Amino acid sequence: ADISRAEVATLIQEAYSDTLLAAAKQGSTVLSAFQNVNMGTKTTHLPVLAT
Amino acid sequence: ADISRAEVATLIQEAYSDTLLAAAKQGSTVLSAFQNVNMGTKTTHLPVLAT
């Protein structure tokens, strides 16, 4: 005796949005606070003044 | 059945970097705080009022 929103089936379509999806990425702190030194092998030796 | 990094001994070289080596040097304080009198001899005499 009446048409409910179930009996209309897929003529009513659900909808989509990006609005909450995007999230900012945060880099390393130490890779921007300090000098990045290139390496070509596992170990690099650095001499320093000692006395 | 497997090669480990201990078994590749000295086919892997160790590198060097001077990026920590360069210490800066600090001058005398008294040579910048006060007048530098040029001398051509061991002794200079300066008279002053005394009474």
Side-chain angles (χ1 to χ4, degrees):
Chain A
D2 63 287
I3 302 173
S4 68
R5 130 189 289 126
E7 286 153 309
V8 175
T10 327
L11 297 174
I12 292 162
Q13 299 181 357
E14 295 180 334
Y16 315 85
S17 191
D18 296 350
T19 301
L20 307 182
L21 180 62
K25 263 69 64 177
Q26 301 298 338
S28 162
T29 319
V30 305
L31 293 179
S32 63
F34 305 130
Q35 183 187 356
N36 300 315
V37 171
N38 189 41
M39 303 172 69
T41 182
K42 187 179 174 75
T43 303
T44 294
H45 292 281
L46 303 99
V48 302
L49 180 73
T51 65
Chain B
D2 179 37
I3 306 174
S4 67
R5 148 184 286 113
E7 286 162 308
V8 186
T10 68
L11 288 170
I12 296 154
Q13 299 183 7
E14 297 177 316
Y16 318 72
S17 183
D18 64 353
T19 52
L20 291 178
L21 182 62
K25 289 88 185 182
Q26 300 297 343
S28 160
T29 320
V30 304
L31 295 179
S32 63
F34 304 120
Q35 183 176 13
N36 300 331
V37 173
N38 185 27
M39 299 174 75
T41 283
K42 187 180 179 182
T43 303
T44 302
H45 299 91
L46 306 98
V48 301
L49 186 72
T51 281

